[PDB]
Design a protein around this nucleic acid. Structure first.
Ligand SMILES: [K+]
Ligand SMILES: [Mn+2]
Ligand SMILES: [Mn+2]
Ligand SMILES: [Mn+2]
Ligand SMILES: [Mn+2]
Ligand SMILES: [Mn+2]
Length: 136
RNA sequence: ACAU
DNA sequence: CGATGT
């Protein structure tokens, strides 16, 4: 209903899906870019959305921030709640890196705690999430 | 049918 | 038009 401006917004960007994947996190109130992941040669949109949320959790935890996180990805929000990224991407030599990062992100979720609310950014009501890459 |  | 997901 109401945007919680005191929050962190995250999003994936890609070149192809599957394709080159990156993500970033921004201050929802200002749009200041707070973190950016170096592009990963092959991944899916949903793996990147997932990595973005988990990086957000780790970012906020390290700084002792109780801000919520916004993501526009129903899939990734669920994967984080489940602590399991049910990606269909083949595991091969090409996808080894993204799968390592995903597996490690899951491992982090299974060994740490957080109270960070993970909230759905309501794109249909509010427009693109502020971390969007402006490519669509 | 909804979310990317 | 193609793909990733619940
Ligand atoms: K969107
Ligand atoms: Mn997104
Ligand atoms: Mn795993
Ligand atoms: Mn986007
Ligand atoms: Mn367009
Ligand atoms: Mn489009």
């Amino acid at each position: 209903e109401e945007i919680i401006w005191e929050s962190l917004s995250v999003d994936v960007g890609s070149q192809g899906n599957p394709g080159i994947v990156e993500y970033k996190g921004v201050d929802t109130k200002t749009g200041e870019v707070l973190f950016e992941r170096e592009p990963i040669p092959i991944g899916t949109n949903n793996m990147g959305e997932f990595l973005a949320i988990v990086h957000g959790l780790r970012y906020l935890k390290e700084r002792n921030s109780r801000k919520p996180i916004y993501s526009d990805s129903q899939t990734a929000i669920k994967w984080v709640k489940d602590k399991k990224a049910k990606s269909t991407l083949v595991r091969n030599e090409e996808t080894a890196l993204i799968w390592k990062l995903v597996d490690e992100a899951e491992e982090w979720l299974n060994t740490h705690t957080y109270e960070t609310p993970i909230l759905k950014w309501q794109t249909d009501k509010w427009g693109e999430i502020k971390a969007d890459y402006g490519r669509k």
